[PDB]
Amino acid sequence: VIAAPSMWTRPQIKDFKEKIQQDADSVITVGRGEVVTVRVPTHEEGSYLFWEFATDNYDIGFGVYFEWTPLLDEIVPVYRRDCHEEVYAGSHQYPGRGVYLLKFDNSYSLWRSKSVYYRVYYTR
Amino acid sequence: GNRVIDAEPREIPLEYADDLLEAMAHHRPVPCSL
């Protein structure tokens, strides 16, 4: 079937951001009421997905879906995360060949844009 | 209220290994569902 993911946190948020900042495409700017989907294909040489993310001043909705290759599976349901006080991270086991959809939901914010610091991984 | 980005999964750097030790030392599980 489909394996449950693990999700955790850690306090080194200023450290994390400084490493990520150095990369151009590892920092997204989600606008007012915006929803930025990040399509992360399964690596043919991989069996697990990992993710790290954070923001600077405000929270943001975050969840993860899985697209089979339009059949979807809700890996992590989209709820708001306090990724501005601690670094949010998690892992999940590939169920097959597909594309992970990392949702950064801001639809609920009428005035504030969110500066997302993120990075994705994989393990053999 | 929508935008799609494409990103390849990177590989865990060997440099950030001491970063995984502090993680496990401080990793505090959170619920996936609230």
From Swiss-Prot, chain A:
Protein known as: Golgi resident protein GCP60
Its biological purpose: Involved in the maintenance of Golgi structure by interacting with giantin, affecting protein transport between the endoplasmic reticulum and Golgi. Involved in hormone-induced steroid biosynthesis in testicular Leydig cells. Recruits PI4KB to the Golgi apparatus membrane; enhances the enzyme activity of PI4KB activity via its membrane recruitment thereby increasing the local concentration of the substrate in the vicinity of the kinase.
Lipid metabolism found in the keyword field: yes
Positions bearing the site annotation: Membrane-binding: R32
Cell location: Golgi apparatus membrane; Mitochondrion
Organism name: Homo sapiens
GO MF annotation terms: fatty-acyl-CoA binding; protein kinase A regulatory subunit binding
Outcome following mutation: S107A: Partial loss of PI4KB- and TBC1D22B-binding
Domain GOLD: 17-122
Biological process (GO), any one: steroid biosynthetic process
Domain remark in the UniProt entry: The central Gln-rich region (Q domain) is involved in binding to PI4KB, TBC1D22A and TBC1D22B. The C-terminal GOLD domain is essential for giantin binding. The GOLD domain is also involved in homodimerization.
Keyword set, alphabetical order: Acetylation, Coiled coil, Golgi apparatus, Host-virus interaction, Lipid biosynthesis, Lipid metabolism, Membrane, Mitochondrion, Phosphoprotein, Steroid biosynthesis
Known tissue expression: Ubiquitous, with highest expression in testis and ovary.
Superkingdom: Eukaryota
Subunit structure and binding partners: Homodimer. Interacts with the C-terminal cytoplasmic domain of giantin/GOLGB1. Interacts with PBR and PKA regulatory subunit RI-alpha. Does not interact with PKA regulatory subunit RI-beta nor PKA regulatory subunit RII-alpha. Interacts (via Q domain) with PI4KB (via N-terminus). Interacts (via Q domain) with TBC1D22A and TBC1D22B; interactions with PI4KB and with TBC1D22A and TBC1D22B are mutually exclusive. Interacts with C10ORF76 and RAB11B. (Microbial infection) Interacts (via GOLD domain) with 3A proteins from various picornaviruses, including poliovirus, enterovirus A71, enterovirus D68, hepatitis A virus, human parechovirus 1, poliovirus, Human rhinovirus-14 (Hrv-14), coysackievirus B2, coysackievirus B3, coysackievirus B5, Aichi virus and human klassevirus. Interacts (via GOLD domain) with Aichi virus protein 3A; this interaction allows the formation of a 3A/ACBD3/PI4KB complex in order to synthesize PI4P at the viral RNA replication sites. Interacts with Aichi virus protein 2B. Interacts with Aichi virus protein 2C.
An example Gene Ontology CC term for this record: Golgi membrane
Region annotation Membrane-binding: where it falls in the sequence: 110-112
Swiss-Prot record, chain B:
Lipidation (N-myristoyl glycine): G1
Effect of R3A: Complete loss of myristoylation; loss of interaction with host ACBD3. Loss of activation of host PI4KB in vitro
Signal sequence segment: none
Entry coiled-coil feature ranges: none
Subcellular location as annotated: Host cytoplasmic vesicle membrane; Host Golgi apparatus membrane
Effect listed in the UniProt record for changing E11A: Loss of activation of host PI4KB in vitro
Effect of N2A: Complete loss of myristoylation
Domain of life, per lineage: Viruses
Membrane topology per record: Single-pass membrane protein
Function of the protein: Serves as membrane anchor via its hydrophobic domain. Plays an essential role in viral RNA replication by recruiting PI4KB at the viral replication sites, thereby allowing the formation of the rearranged membranous structures where viral replication takes place. Stimulates the enzymatic activity of PI4KB, this activation is sensitized by ACBD3.
Subunit structure, interactors included: Homodimer. Interacts with host ABCD3 (via GOLD domain) and PI4KB; these interactions allow the formation of a viral protein/ACBD3/PI4KB complex in order to synthesize PI4P at the viral RNA replication sites. Interacts with protein 2C. Interacts with protein 3C. Protein 3C: Interacts with protein 2A. Protein 3C: Interacts with protein 2C.
Name of protein: Protein 3A
